[PDB]
Structures are given as structure tokens and as C-alpha cells.
Amino acid sequence: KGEELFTGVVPILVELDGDVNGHKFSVRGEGEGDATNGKLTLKFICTTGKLPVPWPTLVTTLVQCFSRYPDHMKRHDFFKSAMPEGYVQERTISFKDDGTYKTRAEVKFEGDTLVNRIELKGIDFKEDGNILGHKLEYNSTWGSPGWVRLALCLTGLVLSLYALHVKAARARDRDYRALCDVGTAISCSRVFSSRWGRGFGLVEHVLGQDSILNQSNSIFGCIFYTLQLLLGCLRTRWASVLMLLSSLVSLAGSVYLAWILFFVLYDFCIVCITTYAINVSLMWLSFRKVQENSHNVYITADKQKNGIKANFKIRHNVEDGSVQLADHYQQNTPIGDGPVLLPDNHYLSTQSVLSKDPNEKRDHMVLLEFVTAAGITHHH
């Protein structure tokens, strides 16, 4: 019956009393929620002055009853079924190599308003870590790619440019010797100028040799490493998936060319092995990156407490291009004694957009959120 209260837009009040390493603070948020579209719109203000932690670390703590459950999943919506009596949501949030938040909140209807009242205690944070030191990005669209990605892409670029220089000197001068041409046993310019050194050897078979796509592999390389470095500076999803696909094609071509270098050409190419290692590293970084941009809350039932349990990882962007992991363990227990929906295993998909209000001089955070339930299973 609790679902009836969520057709339409519902006003939202959030109140948090917090203590992090002895620094006491309070947050109040106000807004509205539209469960039909899984849309939350809220504004949060630190009422005690300045927040002692970065705002992104409080997003998960600061109303999953506003998630959109598709029709075929209606009976797996524990959060709405607990209303109006509400539920207790308790969490432990472990920041990797740093402190811990412990939160207890009551989410319930007071009059017409959905109210989330939170108590938060943070402990064991280091004063110059990413949290207390405020080293996390807020909502930057252009940011750092990290010195690992910069090193990989710049090295790959230098190697591609060098291979271009070698090809442009050998085709000009037959007797030219590159640095990676050592004696008569080791030769890189012989590898570059083979049929596989252009279009990976397979563009001439499919598009013909006349094609503009039948370029030297180092052209694909300059474009690839420049593209990887550029997309590493972005924070959206399309940059991430594009990164994954491009690094996957790059990995396939690199494995093929590695099979050609040995076993077929039987040559020693030092720049080639270097590039292979680069492309493996960028493959790993891209796979990891796709893992890191997905906020998915994994929900299972708890029949002992007649509630639910949830596990998920959140990764906050650090200003230097690295990531800060925050492990989330969650449990929800109904406040009343009426019946609730004990769901099958599923997950919630969440997209958050943080912003600033130019007419708010208090330390604050404007939050827009879209949450939809998915991945329903009868299993586990």
C-alpha cells in the first residue's frame, strides 16, 4: 500500500547531525522526489558553517524510496512498501586507506513530507588524506588523466612518431640505420616496412591498398594515444566506453602483430614489445575505468530482520587523476510491524549530477539524481 504515497511529486527534508574526527557539523537539505521517473532534486546546506568533508562523500548518506521500479519489478520495492511508517537505514562506509563513516537514519513520512533524519560518526581519518584534506573533485568536466595515463600515452606517442621517422628515413635512404637496428641480427626498420606495418596488414585485403585507411600503423598510433590521453581527462560515460572499445581493438591488433613479429618474422623489435606493453597497460586501465564509473547498489533480502541488505562500491575522483574507493555496506529494517516486500536479488542504477547555486553563499551542494531498478533475478 505504501506505493500509493509516491505517485506524484513528494516534498523532501533531509537532516544530518555529523561528527568526523571530532569535527561536528550539521546539514539540512530540501527538495522533491518523483518516483515515477526516479528523479530527485535537492539542495543541501551546511548549517554549522563549512563542511569538514567533501560534499561527494555525503551523497550516498544524504531516500531510495524514490527509485523507479519498472512494472515487472513492482513487488521487489521494499522501500516504498515500508511507508508511511518508514524504515531505518544503517550503513558502514569504509574509505580505502582512510577512515570510516557509520550512519543511522530514519526515513519516514512526517505529515506530507518524506523526512530522512541521519546521525553520522566518522572515525580514523587522517588530517592530510583525501577526505579531511579535500582532495576530491566536485563536478569537474575537464580534469586530470593521472600521471600513469599521461606517461603511457606520451610514451606511445613518442614511439609512434619515432617509427614514422624511421620509415621516412629508410624509404628515403636505403642504407639508413635506425637506433633499434643493431648489427645484422636485430632490426626494427625491417619490421616496420613489412606488409603488416601498414593497416595492420589486413586493410589491403578488405579495403584494397588504394584506401586512405591503409596508413602506417603509427598513424593509428598517434591518433590512438592522443585520443586515450584526451578521453582520460573527461568524466562522462561515453569517454569511458569509447576508451574501452578503442583499447580493445588496439589490444587485438597488438596481439596479432606480436604473433607476426615472432614465429613469422622471427625478428627482435624492441619498440614493438614496448608498445605491446603500453597497450596491455591501457587495456587494464580502461577495463578498470569502466568498472569505476558504474554506481550500482546491489540489493538482497534479509529474512531474519525482515528487511534488506545492500553492498556496493563508490569511487570518487581525486584531483591528481587517481580514484578513492568507498566501500558501502547497508542494511534496512522496517519501523512498523506491517508487512513489507522482501525482494529478490536486484540492483539500483544511479546517475548523480552535482552543481552549485550561484545565489547561495553558504557551503552547499545542489543534487540532481536519476535512479532506476534493474537486473531482477530469482537466483542466489
Ligand X SMILES: CC(=O)C[C@@H](c1ccccc1)c1c(O)c2ccccc2oc1=O
Residues annotated within the binding site for phylloquinone are 272, 276
- Select the span of 137-145, 191-199, 283-291, 369-377 touching ligand X (CB under 6 A): 191-199
- Count, residues near ligand X per rule CB under 6 A: 21
Q: Pick the binder of ligand X from 26, 48, 194, 333 (CB under 6 A).
A: 194
Query: Does the protein bind ligand X through residue 192 (CB under 6 A)?
Result: yes
Using rule CB under 6 A, residue 228 touches ligand X:
no
Q: In the complex, what is the shortest distance from the CB of residue 334 to ligand X, in angstroms, rounded to a whole number?
A: 57
Measured from the CB of residue 232, what is the shortest distance to ligand X in angstroms?
A: 19
CB-wise, 191 or 365, nearer to ligand X? 191
C-beta of 152: minimal distance to ligand X in Å? 13
User: Per CB under 6 A, does 330 bind ligand X?
Assistant: no
Q: Using the minimum distance from each CB to ligand X, give the nearer residue, 258 or 354.
A: 258
Quick one: which of 10, 12, 82, 163 contacts ligand X (CB under 6 A)?
163
Is 196 one of the binding residues for ligand X (CB under 6 A)? yes
Give the binding range for ligand X (CB under 6 A) out of 81-89, 258-266, 300-308, 324-332. Answer: 258-266
In three-state form (DSSP H/G/I as H, E/B as E, the rest C), the secondary structure along the chain is CHHHHHCCEEEEEEEEEEEECCEEEEEEEEEEEECCCCEEEEEEEECCCCCCCCHHHHCCCCCHHHCECCHHHHHHCHHHHCCCCCEEEEEEEEECCCCEEEEEEEEEEECCEEEEEEEEEEECCCCCCCCCCCCECCCCCECCCCHHHHHHHHHHHHHHHHHHHHHHHHCCCCCCCCCCCECCCECCHHHHCCHHHEHHHCHHHHCCCCCCCCCEHHHHHHHHHHHHHHHHCECCHHHHHHHHHHHHHHHHHHHHHHHHHHHHHCCCCHHHHHHHHHHHHHHHHHHHHHHHCCCEEEEEEECCCCEEEEEEEEEEEECCCCEEEEEEEEEEEECCCCCCCCCCCEEEEEEEEEECCCCCCCCEEEEEEEEEEECCCCCC
Q: Which range touches ligand X (CB under 6 A), out of 119-127, 216-224, 325-333, 366-374?
A: 216-224
| Site membership for ligand X, residue 229 (CB under 6 A) | no
Q: Report which residue type is found at 37.
A: N
Kindly state whether residue 197 participates in binding ligand X, applying the rule CB under 6 A. yes
Smallest gap from residue 229 Cβ to ligand X (A): 17
Q: Which three cell numbers stand for residue 254?
A: 597488438
* Residue 247 contacts ligand X per CB under 6 A: no
Q: Is 116 in the site for ligand X (CB under 6 A)?
A: no
Using CB under 6 A, which of 272, 283, 285, 297 touches ligand X? 272
Q: Under the rule (CB under 6 A), what is the footprint of ligand X? A: 159-160, 163, 191-192, 194, 196-197, 217-218, 221, 253-254, 257, 260-261, 265, 269, 271-272, 275
